[PDB]
Amino acid sequence: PSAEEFQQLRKKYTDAGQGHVFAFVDELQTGERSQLFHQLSSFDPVRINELADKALNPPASLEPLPDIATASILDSDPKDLEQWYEEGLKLVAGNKVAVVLMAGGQGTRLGSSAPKGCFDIGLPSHKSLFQIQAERIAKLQLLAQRISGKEAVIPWYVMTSGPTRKPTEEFFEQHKYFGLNKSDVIIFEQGVLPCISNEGKILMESKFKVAVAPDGNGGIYQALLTSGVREDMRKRGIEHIHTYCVDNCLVKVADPVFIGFAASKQVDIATKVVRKRNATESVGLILQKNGKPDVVEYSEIDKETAEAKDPKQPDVLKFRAANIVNHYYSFKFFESIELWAHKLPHHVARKKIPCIKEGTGPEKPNGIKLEQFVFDVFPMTPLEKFACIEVRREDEFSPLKNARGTGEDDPDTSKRDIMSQGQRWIEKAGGIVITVGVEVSPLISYGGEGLEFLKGREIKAPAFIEK
Ligand SMILES: CC(=O)N[C@H]1[C@@H](OP(=O)(O)O)O[C@H](CO)[C@@H](O)[C@@H]1O
Ligand SMILES: N[C@@H](CC(=O)O)c1cccs1
Ligand SMILES: CCc1c(C)nn(C)c1N
């Protein structure tokens, strides 16, 4: 980079009051100077000031969603469920369904060196989360081809962060994309934002590098633009998109009932909830805020509304629609990302951020991280174009939040929930499990179907059913 270019960027950053980022320029080699220039050129210091000022010196009517925006697998006529299943499989057969996997962030509570998706929860098969999810996609394609006689393709768009992108790609490569076609799997990367000190200043990770952090799972939308994923969806004729979080080992990827329901109700956005397990559960709550669909994140709710009770049922929580990060979107919505993505607010968390001030190294929080949330598009959705669908936790939601030996939301509960699901399915089909649980490969059964061959047979738990 030329001296005139470098000087123009230094004036920009200095005039914006961020001139410290050049404080160690005189000590840098050419490579380190080149890095700093390119990194700093990717941010607008003035925009950073505006974000910092909103975050650091910042400036509601809550009810449960109305019954016209809600649904429940429990209250559902089994004929509707069967019809929605069939229409969902028809949409897969028409190559109209895509999956976006949010596999970014860090996964800091589990404390793994690898991307969370790689984690092996200890099933008999030792499949990772990624592989279980990939095989559900493959199975669903197989089921769809049974009705169409033609190839069925659910493209898998896998969003990672800067940190996790390279280990994610190597892993997929080493597993040959889990039997999927690499041309139908796109790994891409969310954006970053610089970390901001408590005094509003950009934090320097090193003498030549700014401390950045991923911009939240709400960064998914803009990243679909700049990565070309949205254009790939358009080329393929995608009309229905399922987005989910990688940490849930029970996730029904591209759930045909969910998608069939959303498409058939012609909603623009849909989302799955489970009954909140208690008042302190670390889950966003889905509700009606100032007349619109909305979510209150567990990190921003007050003890008041989290503890609020149903007027008629004094021991049930008034707000209990727990977000399980399972969203439906009509493709039409993604066509206007340019119009609304920059409207998504920036949520603030105080962080201890390793940085340099004459050498690297922070006891108490020295700055903040900014994040957009994926559910903050819900207030953009008309109530009659929104569906909040209750599902069964024990079939649909088993998150890996914590390291082993926590007690909940950890690898042991994940493994327990998967193998209880398998046993229950096998028992429904007439099999006898002896004994815990049974792992059922997604390639054998996506959601309980195709287990007739186990009828009358005895299975000694633990067991593993594959091809
Ligand atoms: C922005 C976002 O998606 N937050 C989600 C997500 O929380 P995490 O902080 O990422 O663990 O997972 C929860 C389900 O496990 C969900 O209830 C919550 O609202
Ligand atoms: N997703 C969480 C994780 C964190 O505390 O870093 C955030 C909330 C608000 C800003 S970041
Ligand atoms: C979620 C509803 C929607 C669609 C479709 N397009 N736009 C701009 C909105 N808000």
Side-chain angles (χ1 to χ4, degrees), residues 1-25 27-53 55-302 304-311 313-359 361-363 365-467:
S2 74
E4 174 173 53
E5 291 171 308
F6 200 97
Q7 175 50 39
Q8 288 215 326
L9 191 71
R10 191 171 183 149
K11 194 221 199 329
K12 267 194 51 166
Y13 269 80
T14 301
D15 287 352
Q18 302 283 351
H20 62 292
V21 297
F22 300 90
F24 305 83
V25 153
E27 322 176 11
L28 305 181
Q29 356 267 269
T30 303
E32 299 169 322
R33 174 191 171 271
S34 198
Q35 295 183 61
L36 184 59
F37 172 86
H38 290 115
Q39 193 184 24
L40 293 176
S41 304
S42 64
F43 304 107
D44 180 2
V46 163
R47 171 136 194 90
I48 297 313
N49 288 335
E50 301 172 344
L51 298 165
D53 171 79
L56 293 170
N57 299 117
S61 156
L62 274 345
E63 293 305 315
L65 282 163
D67 286 349
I68 57 99
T70 65
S72 177
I73 192 203
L74 319 170
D75 310 333
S76 284
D77 186 343
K79 308 208 157 175
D80 289 348
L81 297 176
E82 200 57 51
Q83 177 189 140
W84 293 327
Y85 181 82
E86 290 167 3
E87 276 154 19
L89 261 198
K90 200 178 280 51
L91 294 174
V92 177
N95 302 317
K96 296 184 187 302
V97 174
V99 171
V100 182
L101 163 52
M102 301 177 292
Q106 331 282 14
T108 51
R109 293 170 263 178
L110 171 59
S112 202
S113 45
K116 205 179 251 186
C118 299
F119 199 96
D120 159 27
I121 62 167
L123 298 167
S125 75
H126 295 265
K127 293 172 193 187
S128 59
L129 301 180
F130 279 138
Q131 177 168 349
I132 290 155
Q133 287 156 28
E135 278 171 11
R136 283 174 188 147
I137 288 186
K139 183 62 179 194
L140 205 48
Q141 293 179 164
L142 261 18
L143 292 166
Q145 291 172 173
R146 184 168 312 267
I147 81 183
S148 73
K150 298 179 165 309
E151 244 216 337
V153 167
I154 298 156
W156 201 15
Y157 305 110
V158 175
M159 184 184 90
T160 60
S161 57
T164 65
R165 192 239 186 81
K166 168 181 296 187
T168 295
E169 282 195 31
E170 299 173 346
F171 191 83
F172 278 53
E173 281 156 15
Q174 285 290 336
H175 286 84
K176 305 171 188 198
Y177 281 82
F178 316 106
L180 298 173
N181 296 318
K182 119 144 67 182
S183 79
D184 302 317
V185 185
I186 294 86
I187 299 158
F188 67 106
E189 211 181 291
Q190 50 172 329
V192 301
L193 283 170
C195 302
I196 312 302
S197 83
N198 303 333
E199 291 82 19
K201 300 306 189 189
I202 293 170
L203 287 166
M204 292 297 287
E205 194 164 277
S206 77
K207 294 173 191 159
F208 59 99
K209 187 192 193 113
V210 166
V212 307
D215 61 6
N217 64 5
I220 179 187
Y221 305 106
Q222 181 52 235
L224 298 169
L225 291 210
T226 68
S227 69
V229 170
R230 184 183 66 178
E231 170 196 339
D232 194 72
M233 297 177 177
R234 191 175 9 251
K235 303 198 299 184
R236 287 171 190 265
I238 297 303
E239 292 180 46
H240 310 283
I241 301 93
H242 178 219
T243 304
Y244 72 95
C245 179
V246 69
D247 70 11
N248 172 13
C249 65
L250 292 177
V251 59
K252 285 171 153 53
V253 187
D255 180 5
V257 181
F258 180 48
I259 290 156
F261 173 93
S264 154
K265 299 302 181 192
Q266 301 205 20
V267 291
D268 297 318
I269 290 173
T271 207
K272 291 184 172 174
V273 288
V274 306
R275 194 187 194 278
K276 190 182 188 188
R277 76 157 76 98
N278 60 49
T280 58
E281 196 191 357
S282 302
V283 290
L285 287 168
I286 308 203
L287 41 72
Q288 189 186 209
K289 179 171 177 186
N290 301 335
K292 317 248 213 65
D294 211 336
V295 178
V296 178
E297 187 68 316
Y298 60 89
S299 60
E300 294 170 356
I301 190 172
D302 41 316
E304 183 99 36
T305 115
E307 273 170 17
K309 294 295 187 296
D310 187 307
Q313 286 201 301
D315 199 0
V316 338
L317 292 179
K318 180 177 184 193
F319 302 107
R320 49 189 193 281
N323 175 34
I324 65 164
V325 198
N326 264 266
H327 316 304
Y328 166 91
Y329 315 83
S330 173
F331 183 61
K332 229 136 29 59
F333 182 51
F334 288 173
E335 229 64 70
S336 48
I337 285 166
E338 295 96 334
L339 305 183
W340 51 259
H342 59 273
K343 289 178 203 152
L344 297 177
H346 289 92
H347 301 265
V348 188
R350 294 239 187 252
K351 292 285 159 178
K352 281 159 280 190
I353 294 165
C355 57
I356 63 103
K357 278 243 38 60
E358 283 74 14
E363 290 209 49
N366 57 331
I368 57 183
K369 187 208 171 174
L370 295 182
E371 279 196 11
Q372 298 182 122
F373 292 164
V374 62
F375 49 71
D376 282 340
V377 292
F378 291 3
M380 293 172 193
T381 308
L383 240 9
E384 82 271 11
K385 306 305 292 187
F386 184 85
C388 177
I389 306 163
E390 176 189 20
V391 298
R392 283 179 247 265
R393 181 179 292 262
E394 67 272 9
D395 295 328
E396 306 233 14
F397 180 59
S398 181
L400 172 58
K401 302 298 188 184
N402 309 309
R404 195 105 54 174
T406 300
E408 77 188 345
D409 298 349
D410 75 6
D412 293 319
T413 60
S414 299
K415 161 177 189 177
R416 182 204 59 203
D417 290 346
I418 280 269
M419 287 176 70
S420 155
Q421 180 173 65
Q423 174 165 354
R424 283 153 53 229
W425 288 350
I426 291 160
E427 295 176 344
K428 284 213 53 181
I432 298 100
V433 192
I434 284 317
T435 301
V436 85
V438 183
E439 171 184 11
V440 177
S441 169
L443 297 184
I444 288 295
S445 189
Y446 175 91
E449 89 292 340
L451 295 171
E452 302 87 340
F453 74 98
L454 290 176
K455 177 164 176 199
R457 190 186 298 172
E458 282 180 7
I459 291 93
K460 48 111 195 67
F464 171 33
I465 311 277
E466 261 264 49
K467 317 192 63 203

Coordinates of all heavy atoms in Angstrom, one line a residue, residues 335-367, unseen atoms left out:
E335 N -35.4 -11.5 -0.9 CA -35.2 -10.6 -2.0 C -35.0 -9.1 -1.6 O -34.5 -8.3 -2.4 CB -36.4 -10.7 -2.9 CG -36.0 -10.8 -4.4 CD -35.3 -12.1 -4.5 OE1 -36.0 -13.2 -4.4 OE2 -34.0 -12.2 -4.7
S336 N -35.4 -8.7 -0.4 CA -35.3 -7.3 0.0 C -34.4 -7.1 1.2 O -34.4 -6.1 1.9 CB -36.7 -6.8 0.4 OG -37.4 -7.7 1.3
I337 N -33.4 -8.1 1.4 CA -32.4 -7.9 2.4 C -31.7 -6.5 2.4 O -31.5 -5.9 3.4 CB -31.4 -9.0 2.3 CG1 -32.0 -10.3 2.9 CG2 -30.1 -8.7 3.1 CD1 -31.1 -11.6 2.5
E338 N -31.4 -6.0 1.2 CA -30.9 -4.7 1.0 C -31.7 -3.6 1.7 O -31.2 -2.6 2.2 CB -30.8 -4.3 -0.4 CG -29.8 -5.2 -1.2 CD -30.4 -6.4 -1.9 OE1 -31.5 -6.8 -1.5 OE2 -29.9 -6.8 -2.9
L339 N -33.0 -3.8 1.8 CA -33.9 -2.8 2.3 C -34.0 -2.8 3.8 O -34.1 -1.8 4.5 CB -35.3 -2.9 1.8 CG -35.3 -2.9 0.2 CD1 -36.8 -3.0 -0.3 CD2 -34.6 -1.7 -0.3
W340 N -33.8 -4.0 4.5 CA -34.1 -4.1 5.9 C -32.9 -4.7 6.7 O -33.0 -4.5 8.0 CB -35.3 -5.0 6.1 CG -35.3 -6.3 5.4 CD1 -36.0 -6.6 4.3 CD2 -34.7 -7.5 5.9 NE1 -35.8 -7.9 4.0 CE2 -35.0 -8.5 4.9 CE3 -33.8 -7.8 6.9 CZ2 -34.5 -9.8 5.0 CZ3 -33.4 -9.1 7.0 CH2 -33.7 -10.1 6.0
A341 N -31.9 -5.3 6.2 CA -30.9 -5.9 7.0 C -30.2 -4.9 7.9 O -30.0 -5.2 9.1 CB -29.9 -6.6 6.2
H342 N -29.9 -3.7 7.4 CA -29.3 -2.6 8.2 C -30.2 -2.0 9.3 O -29.7 -1.2 10.1 CB -28.8 -1.5 7.3 CG -29.9 -0.9 6.5 ND1 -30.3 -1.4 5.3 CD2 -30.7 0.1 6.8 CE1 -31.4 -0.7 4.9 NE2 -31.6 0.2 5.8
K343 N -31.5 -2.4 9.3 CA -32.4 -2.0 10.3 C -32.2 -2.8 11.6 O -32.8 -2.5 12.6 CB -33.8 -2.0 9.9 CG -34.2 -0.9 8.9 CD -35.7 -1.1 8.5 CE -36.0 -0.4 7.1 NZ -37.2 -1.2 6.5
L344 N -31.5 -4.0 11.5 CA -31.5 -4.9 12.7 C -30.7 -4.3 13.8 O -29.5 -3.8 13.6 CB -30.9 -6.2 12.3 CG -31.7 -7.0 11.2 CD1 -31.1 -8.3 10.8 CD2 -33.1 -7.2 11.7
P345 N -31.2 -4.2 15.0 CA -30.5 -3.5 16.1 C -29.2 -4.3 16.5 O -29.1 -5.5 16.3 CB -31.5 -3.4 17.2 CG -32.4 -4.5 16.9 CD -32.5 -4.6 15.5
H346 N -28.3 -3.6 17.2 CA -27.1 -4.2 17.6 C -27.2 -4.4 19.1 O -27.3 -3.4 19.9 CB -25.9 -3.3 17.3 CG -25.5 -3.3 15.8 ND1 -26.0 -2.4 15.0 CD2 -24.8 -4.2 15.1 CE1 -25.6 -2.6 13.7 NE2 -24.9 -3.7 13.8
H347 N -27.2 -5.7 19.5 CA -27.3 -6.0 20.9 C -25.9 -5.9 21.5 O -24.9 -6.2 20.9 CB -27.9 -7.4 21.1 CG -29.3 -7.5 20.5 ND1 -30.4 -7.4 21.3 CD2 -29.7 -7.7 19.3 CE1 -31.5 -7.5 20.6 NE2 -31.1 -7.7 19.3
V348 N -25.8 -5.6 22.8 CA -24.5 -5.3 23.5 C -24.2 -6.3 24.6 O -25.1 -6.5 25.4 CB -24.5 -3.8 24.1 CG1 -23.1 -3.5 24.6 CG2 -25.0 -2.8 23.0
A349 N -23.0 -6.8 24.6 CA -22.6 -7.6 25.8 C -21.2 -7.1 26.2 O -20.3 -6.9 25.4 CB -22.5 -9.1 25.5
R350 N -21.0 -6.9 27.5 CA -19.7 -6.5 28.0 C -18.8 -7.7 28.0 O -19.2 -8.9 28.3 CB -19.8 -6.0 29.5 CG -20.6 -4.6 29.6 CD -19.7 -3.5 30.2 NE -20.4 -2.3 30.5 CZ -20.3 -1.2 29.8 NH1 -19.4 -1.0 28.8 NH2 -21.1 -0.1 30.1
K351 N -17.5 -7.5 27.6 CA -16.6 -8.6 27.5 C -15.2 -8.3 28.0 O -14.8 -7.1 28.0 CB -16.5 -9.0 26.0 CG -17.7 -9.7 25.4 CD -17.9 -11.1 25.9 CE -19.3 -11.6 25.8 NZ -19.4 -13.0 26.2
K352 N -14.6 -9.3 28.5 CA -13.1 -9.2 28.7 C -12.5 -9.5 27.4 O -12.6 -10.6 26.8 CB -12.7 -10.2 29.8 CG -12.9 -9.7 31.2 CD -12.9 -10.9 32.2 CE -14.3 -11.6 32.2 NZ -14.4 -12.5 33.3
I353 N -11.7 -8.5 26.8 CA -11.2 -8.7 25.5 C -9.7 -8.5 25.5 O -9.2 -7.4 25.8 CB -11.8 -7.6 24.5 CG1 -13.3 -7.9 24.4 CG2 -11.1 -7.6 23.2 CD1 -14.1 -6.8 23.8
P354 N -8.9 -9.6 25.3 CA -7.5 -9.5 25.4 C -7.0 -8.5 24.3 O -7.4 -8.6 23.1 CB -7.0 -10.9 25.1 CG -8.2 -11.6 24.4 CD -9.4 -11.0 25.0
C355 N -6.2 -7.6 24.7 CA -5.8 -6.5 23.8 C -4.4 -6.0 24.3 O -3.9 -6.4 25.3 CB -6.8 -5.3 23.9 SG -7.2 -4.7 25.5
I356 N -3.9 -5.0 23.6 CA -2.6 -4.4 23.9 C -2.7 -3.0 24.4 O -3.5 -2.2 23.8 CB -1.5 -4.6 22.8 CG1 -2.0 -3.8 21.6 CG2 -1.3 -6.0 22.4 CD1 -1.2 -2.5 21.4
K357 N -2.1 -2.6 25.4 CA -1.7 -1.2 25.8 C -0.3 -1.3 26.3 O -0.1 -1.6 27.5 CB -2.7 -0.6 26.8 CG -4.0 -0.1 26.1 CD -4.2 1.4 26.3 CE -2.8 2.1 26.2 NZ -2.1 2.0 24.9
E358 N 0.7 -1.2 25.4 CA 2.1 -1.5 25.7 C 2.2 -2.9 26.1 O 2.6 -3.3 27.3 CB 2.7 -0.5 26.7 CG 3.0 0.9 26.2 CD 1.8 1.7 26.0 OE1 0.7 1.4 26.5 OE2 1.9 2.8 25.3
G359 N 1.9 -3.8 25.2 CA 2.0 -5.3 25.5 C 0.6 -5.8 25.7 O -0.4 -5.2 26.1
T360 N 0.4 -7.1 25.4 CA -0.9 -7.8 25.4 C -1.3 -8.1 26.8 O -0.5 -8.5 27.7 CB -0.8 -9.1 24.5
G361 N -2.6 -8.1 27.0 CA -3.2 -8.4 28.3 C -3.9 -7.2 29.0 O -3.8 -6.1 28.6
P362 N -6.6 -8.6 30.9 CA -7.8 -7.9 31.3 C -8.6 -8.6 32.4 O -9.2 -9.6 32.1 CB -8.6 -7.9 30.0 CG -8.1 -9.0 29.2 CD -6.8 -9.6 29.8
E363 N -8.5 -8.1 33.6 CA -9.2 -8.7 34.7 C -10.7 -8.6 34.7 O -11.5 -9.5 34.7 CB -8.7 -8.2 36.0 CG -7.3 -8.6 36.4 CD -7.0 -8.7 37.8 OE1 -7.9 -9.3 38.5 OE2 -6.0 -8.1 38.3
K364 N -11.2 -7.3 34.6 CA -12.5 -7.0 34.5 C -12.9 -6.6 33.1 O -12.0 -6.3 32.3 CB -12.8 -5.8 35.5 CG -12.2 -6.0 36.9 CD -12.4 -4.8 37.8
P365 N -14.2 -6.6 32.7 CA -14.5 -6.3 31.3 C -14.0 -4.9 30.8 O -14.3 -3.9 31.4 CB -16.0 -6.4 31.3 CG -16.4 -7.2 32.4 CD -15.3 -6.9 33.5
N366 N -13.3 -4.9 29.7 CA -12.7 -3.6 29.2 C -13.5 -3.1 28.0 O -13.2 -2.0 27.5 CB -11.2 -3.8 28.8 CG -11.0 -4.9 27.8 OD1 -11.8 -5.9 27.8 ND2 -10.0 -4.8 27.0
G367 N -14.4 -3.9 27.4 CA -15.1 -3.5 26.2 C -16.4 -4.2 26.0 O -16.9 -5.0 26.9

